[PDB]
Amino acid sequence: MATPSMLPQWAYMHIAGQDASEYLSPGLVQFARATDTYFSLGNKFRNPTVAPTHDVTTDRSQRLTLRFVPVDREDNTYSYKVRYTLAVGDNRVLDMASTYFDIRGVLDRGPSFKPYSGTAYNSLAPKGAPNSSQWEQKKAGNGDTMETHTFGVAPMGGENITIDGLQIGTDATADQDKPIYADKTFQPEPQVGEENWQETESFYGGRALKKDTSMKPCYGSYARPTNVKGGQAKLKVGADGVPTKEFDIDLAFFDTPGGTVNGQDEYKADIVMYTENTYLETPDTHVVYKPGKDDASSEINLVQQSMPNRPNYIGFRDNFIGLMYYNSTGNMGVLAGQASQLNAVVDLQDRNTELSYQLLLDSLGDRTRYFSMWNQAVDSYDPDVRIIENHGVEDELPNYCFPLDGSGTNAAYQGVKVKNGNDGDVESEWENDDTVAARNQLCKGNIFAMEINLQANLWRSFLYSNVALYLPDSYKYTPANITLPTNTNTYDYMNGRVVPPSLVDAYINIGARWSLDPMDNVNPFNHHRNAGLRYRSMLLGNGRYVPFHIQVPQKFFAIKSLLLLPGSYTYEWNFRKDVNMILQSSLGNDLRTDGASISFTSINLYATFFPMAHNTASTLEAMLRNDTNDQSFNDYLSAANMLYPIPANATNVPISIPSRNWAAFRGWSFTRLKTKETPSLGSGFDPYFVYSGSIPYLDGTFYLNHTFKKVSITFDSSVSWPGNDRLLTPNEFEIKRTVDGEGYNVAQCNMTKDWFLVQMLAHYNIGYQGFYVPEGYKDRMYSFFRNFQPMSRQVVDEVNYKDYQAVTLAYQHNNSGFVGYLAPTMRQGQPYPANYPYPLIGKSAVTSVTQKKFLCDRVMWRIPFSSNFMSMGALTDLGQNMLYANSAHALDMNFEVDPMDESTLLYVVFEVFDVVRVHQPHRGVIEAVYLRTPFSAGNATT
């Protein structure tokens, strides 16, 4: 039924009663507990659960969403300043978690943009195919008479060729059947040909391009339609300019040579072509070879090669990094009272809010779940890019192509039958059949075919495009037919440079897992297989011109999770209109030069209020106006953040810190950046920032942690801190030991046992009781364990191999006759033995050396400031020996780094407490005190 109703019958059915274990007999309650692990009774009894009916929601008209329009705004030349009055009514409590900007505008991306890696026009074409195009030349011509030579194909049959060109249609009876001639505009379509592999013979017609159109290979060729019937002809230039009703289309007729051939006095057509001038273009390809020096129409401009342009993905950064000024001078935010007017935000230059917020959401959810609201999508690489695992290709079956008829080459055969047998292949006596046709098409032997190792060329192609193109430009050369921009940060320069495919081929480091040596210093978040970047790019669209609407959160730690009480408040924030700073690229080309532009129209502030009951909201208002109920937060990366140069090709960084208190000091962290990839914060515009790839500094996507070989700590100028005899190298840390003869290396790479211990105590917090894989929540995206990748390979021993000849790239050959000569161009050469990689396996293996290294990407090295190198409390044990044995001491740190051929920075993080603490003592009043301990501001001025 359903007849029972109201409260007594809602406690009878346990919709709104007491829980089971209050209504059950108390013998069954203890029986259930007794039997629980092998015969549960928990699912047999319904537990009520009632919402609170009063003092949790208001019945008054109150919005749950409010949109604050700007009260003042001014656009600068590269900044946008937007002020609001953020008001919180009486009995409304606001959380600053739920506030976010709405930014709308127009985004332009340069012509560098190309969110794909193929070509969109043709693409099944050979890259040598040239279209159907005629040219003029003197091949025996003289004067103003030029021979006109046409190369082409005429694909569709006809019935006759006359003065009206192809005749293919026919009219029905109305005064005989009239011919219908193909329209000039579009009728001999290039997509229509024969539908059979049996010839349609007769006459043929086709299309062609003028010699007024310049040749470009068929592969990425495009000409816009000029008719709604998909004609491509341009209008004739008349009296009234290019607008006319005429189209530039002519007819050129051809017949097979010879006087005997066709008429004796006639030379009737066999082929006709609708020549036309078009708006030919290559919107996404570039000519990678030509013999010529001028692009025109010529017999030698039939031969041209084409390659698609480099994929370049453009779109807003990971969490809208760099789209607001944080940690800046003269671009500081504001949150203040409306009457008080005193700012309650202080932003320091030794804070890194943007980096800090990456590390927060490491730890507070997964970063492999994309969110399109706040634009979350973490930069990444595929680990079959960065570390090349190679195993050859399974290709143990030949694969073939076959002709369409599949019977190879056929020849004429007449029938025969014996007149009466007698045995013999001519002596049984054979004679012609008249009931079996002459001219049968039979193929003796096996059908025609051409072998292709598909598997081989499927991994040849992939390996080239994800690795070779992203090699440094010290392995590239400019083609001998084109000129490139002087600027090396232009897209045009980058896709114009050509890399030999022999540098990285599927025939080197084979059977090894090993990142290439020139690919250890290339940022691996600047490639088209970065799937965080791809996501962000395609969440805007596929064209240059993108009107956008994005929602961008607050990130500054003081007011990120603040609960702002009743009162009226001035909120103001500044937004960067610098294209480099706000758009990531997959090549990292300078977008200012390229032509990207951005502008904002309409920035608003959202807020979301819990609709609390007025009674309950004013009880909580009163309680949080107390001076013992002050709201306190800290920066997640609570630290002093400092940069120090490393000169080019320099091996050490001398770092010295003045005498400083170290009370409540935590560890250090460090990572190496590049100067050009790091922008200068504390400036409204940095005009020398010409990068726009993944910024490691702010995105937390480091990749040069593996160039460190030592660090050393000294306090007082006389005491080594790792010098209480706690390490095998007893006065410094060594990160890499290259040349090991005490067996200090561990984990099958060049990394010391000492440092491996340290970086498993700083994270996992265990290493004194054996090493184990850390739990799933003890390791995260930026944790040490996940990004530690030992690797090794053998190479020829160049001193103890007695047939070692050093052959250069030029004099290496392998796939001779089946691949181009140091270029992605067509095949060249002869089948011949290879001579490139030296055998390392099987019989006739060469003597070899062992090379070992690791990569750590997305990890900062960290050394805790704890006697045992694991922290069992945020305020370290040596932070609390600086309340009794401190008076200020100097800290000098020495570092040894690998040489780099470009300027680099060292990023040393000194881990502190960043206390952001805030109190409201009255309505519309807000106060704060900001304090830090071992490094702090206001420690030598008021």
Binding site: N47, T49, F633, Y636, A874
Partner: peptide, 26 residues
């Protein structure tokens, strides 16, 4: 760790009959 002890009052949930209700400041 990197800094995260920025956590709640270390209360427990309030006692009830029928799994849930609200008591406020009581």
């Amino acid at each position: 760790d990197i800094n995260f002890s920025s956590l709640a009052p270390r209360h427990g949930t309030r006692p009830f009959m029928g799994t849930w209700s609200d008591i406020g400041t009581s």
